[PDB]
Amino acid sequence: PWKQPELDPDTPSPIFGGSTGGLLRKAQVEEFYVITWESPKEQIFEMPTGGAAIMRKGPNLLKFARKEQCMALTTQLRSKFRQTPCFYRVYADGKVQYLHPKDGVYPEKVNAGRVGVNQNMRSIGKNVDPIKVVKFTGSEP
Amino acid sequence: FPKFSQGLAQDPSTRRIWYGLATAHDFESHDGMTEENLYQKIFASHFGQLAIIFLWTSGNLFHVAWQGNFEQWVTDPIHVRPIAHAIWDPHFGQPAVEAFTRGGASGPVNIATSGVYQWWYTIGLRSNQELYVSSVFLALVSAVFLFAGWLHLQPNFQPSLSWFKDAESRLNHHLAGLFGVSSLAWTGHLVHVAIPESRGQHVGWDNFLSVLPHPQGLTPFWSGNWAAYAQNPDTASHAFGTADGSGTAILTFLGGFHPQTQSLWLSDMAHHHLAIAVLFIVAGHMYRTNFGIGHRLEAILEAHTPPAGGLGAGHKGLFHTVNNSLHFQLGLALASVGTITSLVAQHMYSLPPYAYLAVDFTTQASLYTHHQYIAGFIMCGAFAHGAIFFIRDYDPEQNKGNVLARVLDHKEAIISHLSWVSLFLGFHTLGLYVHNDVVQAFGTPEKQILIEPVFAQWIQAAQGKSLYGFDLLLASSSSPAYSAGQSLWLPGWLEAINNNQNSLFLTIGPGDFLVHHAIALGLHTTTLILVKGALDARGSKLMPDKKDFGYSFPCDGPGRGGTCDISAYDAFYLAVFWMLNTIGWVTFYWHWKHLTLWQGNVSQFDESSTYLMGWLRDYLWLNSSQLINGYNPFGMNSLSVWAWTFLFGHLVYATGFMFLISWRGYWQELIETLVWAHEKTPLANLVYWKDKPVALSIVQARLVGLAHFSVGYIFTYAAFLIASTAGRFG
Amino acid sequence: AHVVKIYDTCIGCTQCVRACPLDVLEMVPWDGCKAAQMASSPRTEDCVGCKRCETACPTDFLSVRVYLGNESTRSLGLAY
Amino acid sequence: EIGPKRGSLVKVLRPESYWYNQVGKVVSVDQSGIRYPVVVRFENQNYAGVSTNNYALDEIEEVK
Amino acid sequence: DIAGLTPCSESKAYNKLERKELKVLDKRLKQYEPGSAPYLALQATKERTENRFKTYAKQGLLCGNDGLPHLISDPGLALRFNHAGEVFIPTFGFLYVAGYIGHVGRQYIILSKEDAKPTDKEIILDVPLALKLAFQGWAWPLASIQELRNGSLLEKDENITVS
Amino acid sequence: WPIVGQEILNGDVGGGFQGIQITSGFFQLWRASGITSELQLYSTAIGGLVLAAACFFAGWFHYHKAAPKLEWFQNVESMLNHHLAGLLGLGSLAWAGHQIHVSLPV
Ligand code: CLA
Ligand code: CLA
Ligand code: CLA
């Protein structure tokens, strides 16, 4: 984006009684993920882990243990309610990382700033046999 | 923990522990590997398997001599039962030790089934002292090999790569010394020791120098009168231990069996391993090694190219392919060893080589099934290790136009013409059994389609069997083949084959016909599954590049309609089910045809083996009576251990169905639920795993479930085979 | 710790990018196609191995391949 | 014109392809320097369900 | 005779099996009355059984020690010892019928593929065309060798391969 | 029927009759109700074909010709009222009529 939005760790959360699909001991020790978005009204939405919850008008914040749990929610909000979520990654040390709209534009739209990675300039197939690379790793690279 | 692989050590789950064991002895995929270090690590490991063999043999000798009845068995071999090892189970009760002490020994014991008693007794062992002395000998030889695997790994004594890739020297030394000289010495043992021990003379290390094998000595050998050693053979009325009816011969060509011990003449087997030593020493001097004379291997392959071009370039480019590919060399060895292992099974039951083995009915069975089940496992590895060659060690540009590329080019024809034979035998064989099952059921047993195997009966007539009346050359006195070998082998051979109380060329009927064709269904379709996994290992239309992934991977995903079980590992996986089915038919047919012979009622097999209810009624249901009553509510016999094992295999077989039917995704969601409970529990949460728990992988479950499958397939039949035959004693 | 390689036959459909839940794939400009787009795989550390990307590529044979390899906590999809 | 004519049938020569040594109609051809310009359409589906694919000049040849 | 097999006429077990299978019906026939339908049904089965045994004996079949007829497959022994109808002749009776099915299905496949939408012609058949080919296939061996000698039977490397 | 084998299945059941032995308990059902003759079974069969064609006819009528609306289906409280009283209630009362008036004396 213009600039990465820093994390506001104190924002209101949705109205959700709780469930058993929440966070486990891995979260405090290794890492966990949090997602933010801004809603115009009070609505109901399905959580990835558990049941239904009620959003809040204004900013909202959740905490998840997996990136798929977060991106599963973005696909729901972008489609059903047509919003623009953004989620981070929090380590146990307190470090924070801004992941998904890393360029500000979603990945399915091009942008001039991006640089290609893992781009082979050949056709699928048309690559050396494993015997040529028998004693080190990799036939595709 | 895996030091050879850093990729798995970083894995936090339990997949590290499982995959660390399975990839242990796969040296090629290890980290920091080199072609030179590979051969050295193999050469050292192959010393290890020898160390376990010589120790495994030493354990049988000691545990037999210390706890067995070898001294008592020789005096009355027929009636006395052999003893393998004693029993100490404190969870027994008093009725069990009274039942398991059937042997002459004080405590309970296990009756042997291998047949080592008949083997050791034949080669001249008649005491327990001689077995103690031998068990020490192999344990020394075992330790020597362990010292060599360590010694030949050191900085010095470390063979170079050129030393391993010297094929011409390996053939000459191994064909001449390992095969020939060893066969020459074994003849030296049978002559200097065993034949005297049969004829009463006690020969040992004390007196083998003073005692002559022949009265004349070696003066016939130098003079050229080599027929003096075949002058006075042993008579028919000859006891195997005593000198009553003995002779002076050491090399003879009598042919046939010995009358008392329905076994081959020792003087023949002595004469046998001599001639084998001569051909193998002669073949050893063939290839070229550090002298001007000799053949070269590469020059031969390049030459045998047909001019017209039916094979293209021919056998060119193959020498560097075989010599550099270890998987190629391993496929040919297993395919050769796996076939030989079947010969050992087919040629021993018909030609008993040991004394008092034909009478031990339980022992003949296990030796047949043991080798044949091994022959299937080995032979399924040849194709599997042959498929890995196409992925890892195959170079198309080097092997261009040769036979190996021309096979891989038209593989669609091979796999297709194979599928015809499997389908053909499958429809028409089953249709006849089902045609006979029904028409028996409606009370009309004469409408069955019973076809006589004329082509096989034509052979037995051409090999001395006068029952069928074809009157072929060797069943005809006027032919030259009868005239030749009339003085040599035929009087002893014709007497045995025409005797219908031995397993030498048994009578054949229409029931034997259907099974030999049903066996053909197994080999042709089992080969189809393994051939396909090999030729389509490099690529398929569904997966044009399998070679990039590897031999074993789960799948390529649900896309393209589904890609489950495509890899060559999954072809080997499915063939083992057919290997076991095929060997089961082969082995069921051996047991029942022999039981009817031993029970005297051969008509049981001929009339009932034509329809499938006979197999379920007369073979399985009937012979499972004494076994199933091993532990009754009234009491328990000595067969209780077999009935327990008989269920133990019916259970292990079923547990594999879990890993085969139920797949991973059901379980990983379940383990996630137990993880939640372990953390939310008040006191158990204080304990925490070091490695994260996850369900078993996809490929692991196919392996695990196949092990639980095959072990029940084997433990179930072993109990039935031994219990059915032992309880009836015939 | 999986490997994702995209090949020369991409046509800029973006169906691979839309399908991946974990945001491993993104679109980058390129001069080889009509659409003037190409995929990329900058962050394979977050890859999981679902092979939904391969399912969406409409080519004769795939412009995207997931070559499975060494596992990890993120790759095994472990919430714990 | 750079390549084969519109509506012309051609035979494929990619070894990887489901349509190898098979015939298909040329739907279109791009003349902007693209590596794989020739668009081809076949009647038979592949394993996924797609009946079109862009091939190259060298990878296609005349029918039969 | 051949292979140590007796003819079914001279065998004792063959007649033993006849006396057995009839004794079962005679015991079963005692229960019912003479003029009832169960009596007529069993008497017919008795009549068929007596006919099955005499016809198999009249046909020069070979019965073994068990008393059941055996078949011979080599055409040499079959023709030499007059046992050709058993296996050797039905081999040609089948192959005429089996090739009939191939020559018919092969022609329906080729002809429908020369038109538009051949996929619909498989699930929704052209019955007038199928009957036409089905009554034109009496001489399929002629057309096969005609098509082989001509060369329009096989395709020539216009087929998909995999590598 | 008498073709290849297949007549031995018509076992000696008893009663001047031979056929397959059933295990469905219809004979005891037809005796629990008053049924002494075969003529009652014929008429009962012709009734089923008549009622079955009506049921098939209704499926065409109540779909192809005159099909109800979603409102008619959501009238759930009327179903239970009719299906309890009408179907289970009167149906059991009617059977008692057959039991009382016919099956008991027979
Ligand atoms: C009368 C003339 C004559 C004949 C008949 C032959 C015949 C032969 N020559 Mg030969 N040759 C000749 C003159 C002749 N030669 C002369 C004048 C020279 C010059 C010196 C040579 C030099 C020569 C060389 C140098 C070589 C031969 C070889 C061969 C053999 C294989 C050739 C071939 O194309 O494979 C036949 C082609 C095939 C493609 C094989 C088809 C395989 C079938 C279809 C597989 C079926 C399998 C299936 C499982 C079957 C069912 C089995 C089931 C019942 C168990 C063949 C026996 C080769 C040889 O020795 O190999 C044995 C070889 O290397 N020839
Ligand atoms: C009793 C169980 C059983 C049976 C009957 C089969 C049968 C077959 N397997 Mg198989 N298989 C089994 C268990 C079994 N398998 C198990 C447990 C495994 C381990 C996973 C495998 C693994 C396996 C592999 C990996 C392969 C096979 C193959 C084959 C085929 C071999 C060709 C042949 O002889 O066909 C003819 C034999 C038959 C017995 C035909 C069955 C049909 C009969 C005639 C009945 C006809 C139907 C009848 C008219 C009634 C239908 C009415 C109904 C529709 C209402 C055949 C269809 C191979 C194959 O397909 O190659 C061609 C192959 O590659 N199987
Ligand atoms: C001859 C009178 C007739 C005609 C011409 C039609 C025509 C039509 N009906 Mg209609 N229908 C009829 C009678 C008729 N119906 C009757 C009597 C009923 C009450 C059951 C219905 C109920 C009905 C419904 C509920 C629907 C239609 C639909 C349709 C349309 C699609 C037809 C189709 O897919 O064919 C199907 C052709 C068949 C031959 C189906 C045969 C099915 C039989 C009953 C199964 C037999 C069971 C078998 C013997 C058991 C053994 C199997 C074993 C494995 C156990 C079409 C306009 C559908 C529609 O509106 O289109 C979207 C629709 O949803 N009809």
Ligand code: CLA
């Ligand atoms: C001369 C014999 C020989 C030799 C030297 C090798 C050598 C090798 N094989 Mg090979 N193989 C052989 C015979 C041989 N094989 C045979 C006969 C078969 C057919 C069954 C195979 C089938 C085979 C396959 C399918 C594969 C190999 C692989 C390998 C490689 C090592 C894999 C490894 O470390 O696994 C170590 C594995 C283990 C330690 C696990 C084995 C556990 C077994 C299955 C459990 C047995 C049951 C249990 C103990 C019963 C107990 C009874 C209970 C009641 C108490 C290596 C090159 C692998 C390879 O090259 O990968 C690319 C591979 O995938 N082999």
Ligand code: CLA
């Ligand atoms: C005379 C010299 C000589 C001798 C005796 C040997 C002997 C051997 N070499 Mg060897 N070798 C030699 C020279 C020699 N080598 C030279 C000069 C080189 C360099 C070119 C090598 C390089 C070499 C390598 C690189 C390797 C060997 C290996 C082996 C061993 C093979 C494994 C084994 O036990 O098979 C035993 C086989 C037999 C005893 C005979 C054949 C068996 C068949 C099946 C016949 C069966 C007969 C009969 C039916 C059996 C009945 C049994 C009875 C009890 C019932 C064996 C001990 C391997 C090794 O180190 O293993 C540890 C190995 O990897 N060799």
Ligand code: CLA
């Ligand atoms: C008439 C159509 C037809 C023809 C001419 C062939 C021809 C052939 N098939 Mg094939 N096949 C067909 C249909 C046909 N197939 C169908 C429908 C199936 C799916 C069940 C198969 C499945 C199949 C397999 C699995 C295999 C063959 C194989 C073969 C070859 C050897 C013969 C054989 O094993 O027969 C086997 C025949 C069957 C197993 C059953 C065929 C089904 C019926 C009997 C014929 C179809 C008639 C059709 C419906 C009538 C349409 C008439 C029209 C006027 C309406 C041969 C080239 C083998 C091969 O790979 O080649 C070497 C082989 O292994 N076929």
Ligand SMILES: CC1=C(/C=C/C(C)=C/C=C/C(C)=C/C=C/C=C(C)/C=C/C=C(C)/C=C/C2=C(C)CCCC2(C)C)C(C)(C)CCC1
């Ligand atoms: C896939 C593959 C592989 C594998 C292979 C295999 C495994 C094989 C099989 C095969 C086999 C395993 C074979 C067998 C053979 C055998 C035979 C071929 C034999 C025969 C014999 C004969 C010739 C004989 C004759 C005679 C005599 C001598 C006398 C008597 C009579 C008679 C006639 C019997 C490899 C590794 C190479 C690699 C590549 C791929």
Ligand SMILES: CC1=C(\C=C/C(C)=C/C=C/C(C)=C/C=C/C=C(C)/C=C/C=C(C)/C=C/C2=C(C)CCCC2(C)C)C(C)(C)CCC1
């Ligand atoms: C077997 C069968 C059948 C036949 C039969 C039937 C099923 C019949 C019907 C039935 C009936 C036949 C019924 C009836 C009923 C009736 C009723 C149900 C009545 C009652 C009444 C009431 C309800 C009451 C009355 C009253 C009173 C008492 C008082 C006042 C007045 C009133 C009115 C209220 C069919 C073929 C179809 C089918 C198959 C099987």
Ligand SMILES: CC1=C(C/C=C(\C)CCC[C@H](C)CCC[C@H](C)CCCC(C)C)C(=O)c2ccccc2C1=O
């Ligand atoms: C039950 C089950 C599991 C879960 C099973 C588990 C976790 C059991 C394995 C762990 C237990 C604790 C080991 C039990 C001990 C064994 C009896 C002995 C093992 C001996 C080895 C150490 C040699 C899977 O992961 C799975 C995966 C794919 C297909 C099917 C299945 C499946 O069926």
